[PDB]
Structure formats: C-alpha cells, structure tokens
Ligand binder design. Sequence first.
Ligand SMILES: Nc1ncnc2c1ncn2[C@@H]1O[C@H](COP(=O)(O)OP(=O)(O)O)[C@@H](O)[C@H]1O
Ligand SMILES: Nc1ncnc2c1ncn2[C@@H]1O[C@H](COP(=O)(O)OP(=O)(O)O)[C@@H](O)[C@H]1O
Ligand SMILES: Nc1ncnc2c1ncn2[C@@H]1O[C@H](COP(=O)(O)OP(=O)(O)O)[C@@H](O)[C@H]1O
Ligand SMILES: [Mg+2]
Ligand SMILES: [Mg+2]
Lengths: 31, 369, 488, 524, 164
Amino acid sequence: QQRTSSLYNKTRQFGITAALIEILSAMSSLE
Amino acid sequence: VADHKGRVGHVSQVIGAVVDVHFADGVPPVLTALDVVDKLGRDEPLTLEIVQHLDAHTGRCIAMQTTDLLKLKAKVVSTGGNISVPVGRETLGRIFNVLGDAIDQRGPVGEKLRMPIHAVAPKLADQAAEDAVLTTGIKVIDLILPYCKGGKIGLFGGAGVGKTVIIMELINNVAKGHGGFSVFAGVGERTREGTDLYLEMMQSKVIDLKGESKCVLVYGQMNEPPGARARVAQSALTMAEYFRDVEGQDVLLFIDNIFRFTQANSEVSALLGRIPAAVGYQPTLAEDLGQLQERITSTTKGSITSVQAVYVPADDITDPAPATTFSHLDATTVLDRAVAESGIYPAVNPLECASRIMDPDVISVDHYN
Amino acid sequence: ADHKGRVGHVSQVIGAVVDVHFADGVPPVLTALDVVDKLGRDEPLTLEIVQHLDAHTGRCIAMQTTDLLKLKAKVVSTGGNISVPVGRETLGRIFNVLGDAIDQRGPVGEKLRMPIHAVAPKLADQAAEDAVLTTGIKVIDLILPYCKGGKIGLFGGAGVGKTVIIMELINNVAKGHGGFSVFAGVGERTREGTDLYLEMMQSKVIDLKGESKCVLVYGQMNEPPGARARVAQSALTMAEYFRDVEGQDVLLFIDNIFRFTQANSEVSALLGRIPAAVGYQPTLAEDLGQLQERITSTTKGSITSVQAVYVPADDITDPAPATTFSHLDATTVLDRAVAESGIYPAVNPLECASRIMDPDVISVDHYNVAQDVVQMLTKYRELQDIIAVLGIDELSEEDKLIVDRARKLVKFLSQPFQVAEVFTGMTGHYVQLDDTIDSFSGLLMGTYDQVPEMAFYMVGGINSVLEKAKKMAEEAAELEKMRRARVA
Amino acid sequence: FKTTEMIGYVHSIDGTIATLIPAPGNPGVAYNTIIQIQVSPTTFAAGLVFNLEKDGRIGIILMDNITEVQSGQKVMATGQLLHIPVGAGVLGKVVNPLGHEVPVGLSTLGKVDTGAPNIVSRSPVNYNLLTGFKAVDTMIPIGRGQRELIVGDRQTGKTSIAVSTIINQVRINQQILSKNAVISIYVSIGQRCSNVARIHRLLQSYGALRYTTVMAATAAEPAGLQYLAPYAGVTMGEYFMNRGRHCLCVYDDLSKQAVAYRQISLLLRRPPGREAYPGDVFYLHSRLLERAAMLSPGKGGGSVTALPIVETLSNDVTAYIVTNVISITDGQIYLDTKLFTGGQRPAVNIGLSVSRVGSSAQNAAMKGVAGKLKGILAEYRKLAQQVQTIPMIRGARFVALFNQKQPSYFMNAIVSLYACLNGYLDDVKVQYVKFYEYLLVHRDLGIMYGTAKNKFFYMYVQELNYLIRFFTLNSPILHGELEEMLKQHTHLFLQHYQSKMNAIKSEKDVKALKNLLYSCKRAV
Amino acid sequence: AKKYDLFGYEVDTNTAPWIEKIKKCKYYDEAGEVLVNMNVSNCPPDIATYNATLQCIYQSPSKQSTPVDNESKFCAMMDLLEEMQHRNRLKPNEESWTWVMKECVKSGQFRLGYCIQQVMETECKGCPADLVKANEANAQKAKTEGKEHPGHLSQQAGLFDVKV
Ligand SMILES: Nc1ncnc2c1ncn2[C@@H]1O[C@H](COP(=O)(O)OP(=O)(O)O)[C@@H](O)[C@H]1O
Ligand SMILES: Nc1ncnc2c1ncn2[C@@H]1O[C@H](COP(=O)(O)OP(=O)(O)O)[C@@H](O)[C@H]1O
Ligand SMILES: Nc1ncnc2c1ncn2[C@@H]1O[C@H](COP(=O)(O)OP(=O)(O)O)[C@@H](O)[C@H]1O
Ligand SMILES: [Mg+2]
Ligand SMILES: [Mg+2]
C-alpha cells in the first residue's frame, strides 16, 4: 500500500509536468 | 522626500488582472503601487502594483481589485512607493484588506504611520543568538513540541478538530504571558468563515469594541482576484513587523492558509506569461515562500512567531507546495480526529508531532528528559 | 580546400552556440573555425558550424568556453572538419576532442590526420563473424553472451556497476588481446580517467619506453557541451583507422554514450529547436544513428564496442536508452533493486538479451541450459508475487523445490570481480565457459539441492561453491559443539 | 567592481532577469562578464551577461539591489569575468557569491569560472579526512580530494554531520603544521537566514571560524546568487589547493541550487525536460564537483574535498537531481528517516551508504580495526527467540557506540572500537555502553582505585593520538600496554560501576540512572 | 641519481636550496610554508629535509607571532613523521626519532618519552643514554614533588554521581 501510493503520487506529478511541457511546447511553435 | 510621487501614466493594455501602463516621464520602480484616477462608473476603486518593466516608458502590473469597466488610455497616478498599510496600536480590533482600508464600517482608523507591504527580510546580524522557548501556557505544546521565539509553526488537522479554537487560545495566551498582540492573515479564506472568527473573538473579548483589543484581522478572501490573495499575506506581516521592530514585543501571526499564498501566485505567474515548473506551479515557488517566510523570524528587536495552516493538495505530501514549506518550519503540530472524539481536547496527537527546539542545548536538561 | 582561410566575424553569442557572419559566403556544414581575435583568454577557441541561417551567416558550437567573446570578433576557417591524428603514433597517448595531446609527453608522431565526421559504412561493407567473446563472467557468458565484432551496451541507473563492469572487461578480455584499444571518455569523471591511465601504466598495456596497445580520448564533465558531444566521434575516427586502413580487430570503450545524447540536448536547446518527448532534441534518433552505424564490423576490419548507457531516473522507457537498445547486439541491463539486495554484478537477466543466444552460434548444451535459467527465473518472479500476498508455506510441493533452486540461481549469478577486491574484500574469480555451463546445468537437474543457499552467493564456479560449503559445514560444526559443551 | 565603459540602457526587467539596449556606437560587452547598473548616482547593482543577441541587446542576470533596478538606467561594464576576494584574510567571515562581506551580530583574487584539473594533474587519494564519526570514518571513509555525497530526507542530520566535520578539524588543525590543516568552506545555498546565524555561533564557540569561511546565499536573496554560490565556494578552496594546501567544501544544498537554476532557465524560456529542469542541470553540478580534486605531486599535492548535500523526498533516490549528483560523486552517506526516529544519530544507513575510495583513504590504524567491523556487522545484520553468538553480542555494541551528537577525537574513537572488536564490552550490557565509553575517555578507573601501573598508555594523554596513527594498536609497541588499560577498565566497571544495576529498584534512583545515561549519549 | 614521480615525469631532486630556507626558521609554522613551496615547484621533501624541519620544531618557541590554542610541538612533529612514512613512503632514519625524544624531556612530557624510547630501542637500532636518564629524572620529579597525572582524575571516587 505504501509503495503503490507513492507510484500514484509520482504519476500524479509526472503527469502534470508532462501535460504542461507539451501544452506550452505547442505555443512555442505558434510564437 | 519622495520623488515620482504623483507621476502620471496611461493604461496601455488590459488582459485580465494583468494591466500595462505607459508613463511619459519614465516608468516607476518595481512593486510600485498605482491608483487609477479615471472614472466614477465603478463602485470600488482600482489599484495596480507594477511587477515587470517592458521598456523605459511602459510597465506591466497586477490588479488588486477587479479590472471591470477599464478603458484604454485611462489616467493612472503613482502613490509614492509600494502598497502602504497602517500599523501600530490603532490597528488593533479593526479588520483590514490587502491594501489596508478598513472593511468593518467602524469609522476611520487612527493610523499615525503607514509601512510598505514588500519589506526586506532581516540580515544575519539581526538574528537572535538565543533560540528561546515561547511558553504557550498549554501542556501538550510546551512539553512535547515547544514553540520557539521567531518560529514558523504548522497546524496540521482536518475539518472540525480544534484549529480555530487553538488559534484563539494562542491569541489569549500570548497576551497573558508575554502581553503580546496577534495578527490573522486570512489568506484565500472563505468570507463566511471570517465572520465566525470575528464574532467568536468579540464574544471571548480578544477583540473589544468599547475597550482594549489584542488582535488584528487582515483578510484576502476567495472572492478577491489573485493579486490581492497573493499580497495579503505580506500586509498582515507588515503589521506584525511593526510590533516586532518598533514596539519591541513578542507577537503571534496566523496564516490560514499558506498554500493559498503559493496558489494565488500560481495564478498571476500564469497570467504574466512565465513557464510553469513541476506540477504546474510558478518557477519562483521556492523564492516566493523564501521572501515571505524569512521575514517571519526572531530579530534582536522583537519576535514574530507564526502559526500557519498548510493545505496538502490531494493528500500528496511530495507536492512542491507543502514539501518546500517543510524546510522553513520549526514546530509541527498534528491534530487527530479520533483523539478529539475520544474526549481529549486539544486534540493533539503527540507521536506525529515534532519540534526543532526539543533539544538539550536549547531547553533545559530536565525539560528534555 | 578553397574556403581555406576565409575570414568571418562573430554575429551573435548565446551560450556555447555562436553565429558567424562571413563576407564571401559561409563555409560548409561541420566546418571547424579558429577564433583568431585576442581577448584575455588562457586557452584557444574553436567553433564547428552545425547550421546555416542565410548565405552569409552560419550557426556554430564552441568546443572550449565562450567567455570574454566580444561581438564582431575575427574568425577564420581551417579548411574542413575538425581533424584528429591516427595510426600507431597515437597509441599510448591521451587526447582531447580536437586531437591535441593532453599528457605533456612531447609532440605526437602523427603521419596523418582524419576528419571527426566520417560517413557510416554501406550495406555491402557489413560482415557478420559470429564467435563468442568469453568475458569470464557468469551472468554475461551464460545468458547474454557477448560476440566478437558486437556492439554491446551496459544499461543502468546511477551507481549500479557500469564503470565496474567496463574495468572488469578490461582485465578479463582487453589484456590478452592482439588488437589495440580506444577509450572514449565521453562526459564522465576526470578523476576516473587518471585511475585508468595509472592502472594501464602499471600493467603495461600503455608503455612509455616501449610498445603501447591503448588510446585515450577524454572529453569529461568539466568540458562544455560542444566538446562532450563531439568527443565520441574523435575516438571513433582513431578506431576507424585501425579497422579500415590497418585491417585489424579493435576494441572501443564509450563511457558514457548517454553523455553524447545529453550533450547534444544542451546545444539543441540553444540552437532554438523545438524539443521532442521529455525535453530531448528532435534529432535524438538521428544523432545516435550516424554515430552508432559507424561503430560496426566492416569487411576491412572489426570494431568490438563495449558501451556504458546511463538510464536517467531509473526510467528505461526514457528516449536516451530506449533508442539505443535497437542498435546493440548484447544488451546488458543493470537494476538498482538487484544491487541493493546484495547481488553484484547487478544484472537483471530477464530484461537482458543477446543476438548470438542461438543454437547455431553457441553450442546446443549452452543454449538449452541458458534457456532453463531464464525459464526458471520467469517462474520465480511469478511465485515471488504469490509469497508476498499469501506466504511461503502456501506454495505447492513442486513449486517449493523450484523456489529453492531459483533462489540459488539468483545467488549463483553473483560474482566477486577482480577489479572489485577493495569493495568485496575477496579475491576475484574468472569463471570458464565450460565451468559456467556445467555448474548451472547440474543446479537445474537438482544435483546440488542438499548444498546450502549461501554457498552459491559471491563465488566463481562449482569448485568454489563446494569449497565455501565445506567451510560452512566446518564452522557450523564448531559453533554447534560450543552450545553442546554445557550439560545439566 | 571596476567600471570601464557605458555599454547600454536597461530595457526590460522580469524579476531577477533583464535585457539591455546598446548605447549609441554599439560598444558591445564581453560574454559572461559582470556589469554595474547605476540604480542611483551613488549606488550600483551588479549583474552577469548570459545572452548576446544579434540585435545588439544583452541579456542580464540581476544579482544585487533588484528592487532598485529600473528601465532606462545606465549600465557600466567591467570587461572581466567574475573574480572574488580569496585568501587567509577572508577566513572567519560571511561572504556573498559576488564577494561582499556580510555583517554579523554581537588577498589576490581568483576566477569563479575555472576549468577543473586534467588527467595528469590529479593523483590517487591517500590522505585521510576525519569526519569524527565512528560510523563514517570506519565504514564510509572520506579521503582528501574525494567528493562524498550526503543524501536523505529533511531533518535527518545532513547539515549537522557536515558542520561537525568542519568542527572536527579544529582539534587537529590547532596541534598540526598549518601546511596539512583542513581549511573549511561552508556554502549555504537557499537556506533560512537564522540557520546561518546558528551555524556561525556554533562554529565560533568551537574555534572553527579561524579555519573556516562561510559562503552565504539565503532564501531572501535572489536565484542568481543561489545559482552562483557553490561556484564561489570552490574558487575560495582552489586557492589553497593550487598553493599546496588541503581544503574542505560543503554545499548545503545542491537541491536548492538546482531549483534556483531552474527558475533562471524557465524565466528565460529555456526548453525544460525531466521535472521541468533544463537540459544542462547535470552539467551544472558536474563542472562544480569536478573542480574538487586531489592534485599530483607535480602541482603541490593540495586538495579540495567536497561534501555536497542533496535533499530527497520520502527516501526517493530515483528523482532527477538526486540521481545526477550520485552519478558524479564518489559514493554517498545515506541518512535514513527511520533510523533517525529509531534512535541512531547520526542516522547513517551503512548498507545504502558507500565510499568508492575507502580503503586507500583510511589511516593505517583505522584500516586495522575497520576491516573486521565489516565482517561483524554483515553477520549481525543477516542474523538479526534471541540466541546470541559472539558476533551478535559484539555487533550490537558497535551500533550503540555509533550514536553521537558532537564529533569524536581519533584516539577516543579508535580505542572504544578496538575494545568492542577484541570483546571487552561483552559482559557489559547494551544500555551501559555510553557510560562505559564516557568513563574510558574523560575519567580513568585504573588511576582512580589503585590498580594502574601503566608506564605510558593512558586516555588523559591526548598526544598519544599521533603515535597510534603511525604504529597502529596491533603493534609490539602499544599492544600489551593498551590491553592492560582495557582490562583494568572492564574489571573495575563490571565490579564497582555495573553492580548498581542489580541494585537501584526505587523511584529517585531509576530516574537518576536514566538522566545519567541520557547525557552519556551526547558526550562520546 | 635520477628520479621520477608516479606518472613518470622528471622531478627536482635539488634539495639543498630549500634546506637553507628551513634553517632561517624563527617560528616553526614557517617551515611548513616552505615544505608547501617545494612540492609546488615539483621538488618532493628529501629524508634530510624532514630532519631539518624536525630541528626547527625543537629550537623555536611557538607556531607564529601570536600563540595558538593547544600548540603541541610533539603533535606537529608526529604528523610530519606520518606524512613521510605512509604517504611519501620514506623510513625515518636515526636522526628523526632523536629530535622527538629531545622535545619530550625539554617540555617535560615524560610519559610520551617512555613510549618513544621503546620505539627508538625497537625500530632504529637504539636510544643512546643521554636523554633516557634525563627522561627518568622527570619521571622521579613528578613523584617526589606532588603526584603524577592531573590529580583531579585520581582522587574523584564518583560512583553513580559523575558530572557531564
Ligand atoms: N478546547 C476545546 N474544548 C472544548 N471543545 C472544543 C475545543 N476545541 C474544539 N472544540 C470543539 O470542536 C468543534 C470544532 O472546532 P473548531 O476549531 O471550531 O473547528 P474548525 O477549526 O474546523 O472551525 C467545536 O464546535 C468545539 O465544540
Ligand atoms: N562487483 C561489485 N562488487 C562490489 N561493489 C560493486 C560492484 N559493482 C559495483 N559496485 C558498487 O557500485 C558503486 C558504483 O559503481 P560504478 O560502476 O562506479 O558507477 P556507475 O554504475 O554509475 O557507472 C561502487 O562504489 C561499488 O560499491
Ligand atoms: N548526531 C546527532 N545527534 C543528535 N541530534 C542531531 C544529530 N544530528 C542532527 N541532530 C538534530 O536533528 C535536527 C535536524 O538536523 P539537520 O542536520 O538540520 O538535518 P537537515 O540538514 O536534514 O535539516 C537538528 O535539530 C539537529 O540538532
Ligand atoms: Mg560510471
Ligand atoms: Mg540541512
């Protein structure tokens, strides 16, 4: 339970980094 | 003296709360407050704080109130410096907003002085060389997780466990044992929760209308835009800094909630066009908390001792907003619901709690053992 | 070379990336440029053109630091690409990305210089020589055997045993090897470079007075990204000379190939390219393509490259290792949980693979035994999830015997390395291929069921297992006699 | 700083970053140089050049007086890289990355941008560096010129173990020749301001300021200073290294440096990658830590030892900044959170911790005892109802001995470990090991009661420390004389002092026993 | 003869110029500053150089102009021996340990003197009388005058009550 919750929490944060890098890498292409 | 005092400018661009201002005789400094003089179609005034400079004549700002009805080329005038907030014993008993205007309808404040919101944190020489115990007069705290002078203190606990009761008791007990006043930064708080604090303090007589008051309230609530909710933590801290530095006194500060400071800055940082760091927070997350939390410390002149609420989003303690805050904190107070429901008040679970000054060097050997 | 001393001026300086304006048109791509202008520098500056912006302007990358560089500074072409010395005069000497000797032992004898950016061999030049390179290591030789002419990759996270395994391979294989060797110190520790240079001088693979059989080309962490990117190719040019011209079997040692990709990721950002997945350059697959394809066994000679591959954040799905995996012949994967449990080397055998793991290349007895180890370990990982949930006692009668053997297989896969005598506190073990196959074969049969588990941990072949089991029986007999001494 | 030519005007500001427009003529400042912005007629504000655009515009990283910077202000150039004050005169003072001294309550310069020593410039690490901890100096021994990481969670003792390592040098440095003195450089990156003050007082009370200089970039100060703080720290150490002397560098911590560098990179639109950090965040720590080294006999044989601290979140080594620094440094000292709360302080996880050049770094005497301890603790950890072997008894006493607040002196450490190795604390119980060790060091039982008669070897004579380092304990000179001291100490402690534990079954005496034993954990 | 360092570069064996610098000593911390300056100019300390340093430690009064806390000529002296034996790989000759014995009897630290005559007798042939009787004189001097050792340690019974 400890180690799966940590993976849920890592995936939560890693998801939002990766979400926003893609979204803002879009508008660098659009100026 | 005060240069750039009434220097006139015009509104160049308005995109949400973020507003650009063109000045003919050069732009003011950074963090400079600007009153929008134009128009009487608004019901409340508009005050802009400069965050960035674009060119020598243009400067980008953030609105403390809503930016409704704001036309282009509208007349804007400087204040003289940063956003100025009233200080001293005339503030005690009164409620305030981010700017320092009284929001309680009890006449004009007695203010003999005003101080700027964006003060610099104390230097190395100003810091105390005696880590000293702040006796709260409470058994669980003083014995097991003693709060120190200058300390950042953290109040962990779910809904309806005894948070507002403990803050009120600390406002009483600071004033009993050290004679100190208190300040409450309602940072991004519910407006309806602000009424219940004001009434319960009036019933218990920590705030008194007819007589002596020992509390200050500075509220920047959820209804307000991000510019206010961001800066309102510093407004309260300026008032506590006056009681620390000038009056030379032990003072309490109460920030509910310090996450809402970081979250408020996360909104403006997005609108300013800055690229977000980890988990969509502002890239200056550690720096924002740095300049705020470092001002809260025990100087040679006095001691501010801030108890803070910290929201852990999604119960994820690894999140940047709490994780960055944990380094700054001295005494972690954890309140448990099962302890409250069993009959023990205050509901402090002593095993999950901890304090930095729980050490044979700081406190006495008999205290530690 | 007509563009030989063609003069230009520095248009823009943003980090290591520098733009240069040429009056009479820009040089070609990959063209080296010396910055002639004086400044307050201690060391020179050399720029390589990567892109062209217009007919008169060309974007570059700095091999040295770009400190004190003013705008409009005089820059002059060399005549072609960055040129590096080759041949037997290079052997024994240390070099940098450019090819200057960095060991203070006089000028190099260089009879020739070759460009760093060579083109990869065509399809017709390729040739397969499927022979087993016996590394003397149990996990490698049995499960993922390295072949002659093979490109081999050591994938693992920070501090798992990549540099330890390269050093053991230099002991085990590179000493008794009639060919020469090249070591590309690509963006790794400067202090590790000294220990290699000294240990080779002590063992006399590099010799000052006499014959040398090693070349060192170092572009370490202290150097800027332009050097660390290009330094892998400089070493590869020297190995290409021994392969193509001299017609010889050669070893190449790239520690670390991730630092090539990471170095290109820095410049690619400063060049103004839009990043691909996880912030790497969009040309990540192409950068590795042109580098790794040059590393191959031609008809003329044969490179046999061991490479180290850093897995960032222990994320094997990351582009930098994931893209590299396709290029390799024997993929060695090192796991952190295996290292922390006690098993060194930290080789996770299920994620590993080798092309020559085949009944045609290796013997039938080698393949059949090696497959049974992989099969048994696959069953064991499924059983390990059941023990965590239910318990050890809940398993079946036959499955318990599989666990006893599989637990011994994991322990017997560990090996005390000869370079790691300081770490382990025990002498090394070179385990023969015939010893490795026979000992593992008997363990699968169940001939060593009565042998205890800790006998197999950190030893070589079967003789050392039975030796440790004898020592365990004798010491257990003594401690039992001590507790049997007192009566009533 | 020294002004030269007025290169341009300030155009835009964005917190701690700015861009300039060139003045008429377009002089053009040099890259990576300092520039002074005239905030007022009297005052200046420093800044570093990071971008030289084709337009003529110049990107600036602001450092001082950031509130006072404004658009339209004049900008003077130095035309030089960042040099700072370095030498013996800078010791016992707090200083910025730019070199300005910080006031506290009551010298030829050196380049910050410098290349590390090359392959032939360095040499193998042989000189030991004592942290003053029995756990560290035996199992994870640090050599002079080594880079030894300190990792673990918040409040696990990362600073204390680094600060006490600096304090441990004073007892040696005072007695030894100043050629071999370990001069320390504590870099405080992104920390709280009061924490720097408490370390200043703690260094001052133990006489450490004489042999130490404190680099400081607190949380109030901007990201530009935090970014540059470890680089300024090494510069000050390299002076001692290049002039044939040994030095120590603590960076507390590189996690907050990376966050400061990420802020700078993100604010200037540098493409982010893993955990939003830029591409070259590995290169940031790599060129820093590689400048720490052990030079050859040909270049003085000096050293800069590095102790980088890196905070982990919930014991997660897989984070990008943590995994980067592990791959650069020569092993680590892992501080576990469960060991901290469990009792063991410093909370050194020996299984997770490692020194890549341990054996060659250690002293000849320390190598003798420590080689055996690895065998005992390996068997103790594996074997851990009851059933006690000799390894199980002696192994448990080592764990009790490793607990300590302040650092132990080399003589007082090695003798108390040698006692446990040969089995002098076997009859002594586990709870009374610190009382046994205290009475060994400060007091002495042979000289107390009667049965002394040792010709030279005693514990009050601290000067024997350096004789032990030469000859070792296992040697014909000291072996017989040492084994007397320990035999007298054990027999008298068991007879006279440990006899009380069978007695003492009352309230004002059991509490008196506790308060005695609690205080014994602190003093080694 | 010729000599080479660990890499194999040429090394300056010309010791004599740096020896006369150590003779003009005045205070013994200046000797270390010279020993630094030789190594910096690729000139490793000779066996005679260490003995020339050991002489300066004995003769001069303290470290420098001001006195440092816990000076100890013996500890500074024994550190230098550890440097030459282990790291630089040089056996100290008979002259080396005779300088050590002199400082024990001069300062009055006789207890060290007992340990180092045992060393001098076993390691480097012998300890020729002169200082042995001078060391034994200081041993009897402590006994007859008052007591040997601090004395604060000896008298204190303690037993459960011990200050920390
Ligand atoms: N010290 C106390 N003594 C008695 N009751 C208490 C005490 N502290 C809290 N409580 C009870 O707990 C309830 C919730 O506490 P409160 O602090 O108001 O929660 P919240 O902070 O969520 O508003 C109150 O209604 C009160 O009856
Ligand atoms: N065969 C081995 N025996 C013992 N320890 C090992 C072995 N292989 C690796 N290690 C451990 O791993 C650590 C770092 O290994 P290294 O290969 O230098 O790092 P990386 O794998 O990141 O290149 C060493 O300090 C060592 O303790
Ligand atoms: N060896 C030790 N023994 C007892 N207490 C310690 C020890 N080391 C650190 N501490 C205490 O633990 C707390 C946290 O230590 P610190 O070094 O500040 O950790 P971090 O650097 O992770 O914040 C401090 O209050 C300190 O006094
Ligand atoms: Mg490596
Ligand atoms: Mg710390």
